Nucleic acid binder design. Structure first.
Length: 341
RNA sequence: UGUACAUC
């Protein structure tokens, strides 16, 4: 199975083995854990002629290496450090196989690497091969990373078909383990005509989204990178619900982002909501202080409050300072207070 | 004291 050269090599019989000495054996070495390492190492600093010798033996069977547990690394190295002609020739070997590779445990890494290094004409051609398979890829553990890379690297106008597929399914996808990732990449890189519809569906489903295991990240994302009009719509959904959501494992993260990224006015309103509102005998703020998640929202409020408003919070907290010590999460508020005394 | 994101 293994050639004498490869076996003898794994048996450490060639401490000084050079690329040029494995002529004829590139494919075999590329598919071998140690040989693949040997080649990768040797490549970054090989001479163009050495690099070309290695290339000559992998071009024809390049696909075989792209879906290989060790070979995929040798392909990638050519995309990173090979010549322009070598990258173009590798792209040609991918033609017709993008879907198959994008779903592939190792091939998907080659697709991702290629997207980063090839000219836009080739990028665009790779993308078109996913035409009619958007959701299949977005929902695949290998493929979603490829769709993400496309969005990061490819001209946004060529990605219109991905948008088309998302239209009407933004809620479903935003609560998906992989789809929430792709939605965020879209918000970052896509055109206004493309992000708009997507933002519309996110706004329609904010209540549900802030409480979702994966959806909360998409709403947080808009709060940190979104336009003010989009942040405010989200903030308006949190208003009147500060107490309840900040007690929630997932949504409490979103109320922190609202506190942090809201306008001056919106921030003052959210903090006042829980200084004013009473949860039974005492303030909403006091219930929050004792909560496993809500105690985090309080601290964030102390962090970002205007000095004047911070004084009001500290005053709301002060009367409970000795009782806070009796509560697992209460204790944590005291730690915060030291900083401010 | 608290939630996601993949190869030698």
């Amino acid at each position: 199975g293994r050639s004498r050269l490869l076996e003898d090599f794994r048996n450490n019989r060639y401490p000084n083995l050079q690329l040029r000495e494995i002529a004829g054996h590139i494919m075999e070495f590329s598919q071998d854990q140690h040989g693949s390492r040997f080649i990768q190492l040797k490549l970054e600093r090989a001479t163009p002629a050495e690099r070309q010798l290695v290339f000559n033996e992998i071009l024809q069977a390049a696909y075989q290496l792209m879906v290989d547990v060790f070979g995929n690394y040798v392909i990638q190295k050519f995309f990173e450090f090979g010549s322009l002609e070598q990258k173009l020739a590798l792209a040609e070997r991918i033609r017709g196989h993008v879907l198959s590779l994008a779903l592939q445990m190792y091939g998907c890494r080659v697709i991702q690497k290629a997207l980063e290094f090839i000219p836009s004409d080739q990028q665009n051609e790779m993308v078109r091969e996913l035409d009619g398979h958007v959701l299949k890829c977005v929902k695949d553990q290998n493929g979603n990373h490829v769709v993400q890379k496309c969005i990061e690297c490819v001209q946004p106008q060529s990605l219109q078909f991905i948008i088309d597929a998302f239209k009407g399914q933004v809620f479903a996808l935003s609560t998906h383990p992989y789809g929430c990732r792709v939605i965020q990449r879209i918000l970052e890189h896509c055109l206004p005509d493309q992000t708009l519809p997507i933002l519309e569906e996110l706004h329609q489903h904010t209540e549900q989204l802030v409480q979702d295991q994966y959806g909360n990240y998409v709403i947080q994302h808009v709060l940190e990178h979104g336009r003010p009009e989009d942040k405010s719509k989200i903030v308006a959904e949190i208003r009147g619900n500060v107490l309840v959501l900040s007690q929630h494992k997932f949504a409490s993260n979103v109320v922190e982002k609202c506190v942090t990224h809201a306008s001056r006015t919106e921030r003052a309103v959210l903090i006042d909501e829980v200084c004013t509102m009473n949860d039974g005998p005492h303030s909403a703020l006091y219930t929050m202080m004792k909560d496993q998640y809500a105690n985090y929202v309080v601290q964030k409020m102390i962090d970002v409050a205007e000095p004047g408003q911070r004084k009001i919070v500290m005053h709301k907290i002060r009367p409970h300072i000795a009782t806070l010590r009796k509560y697992t999460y209460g204790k944590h508020i005291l730690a915060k207070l030291e900083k401010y005394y």
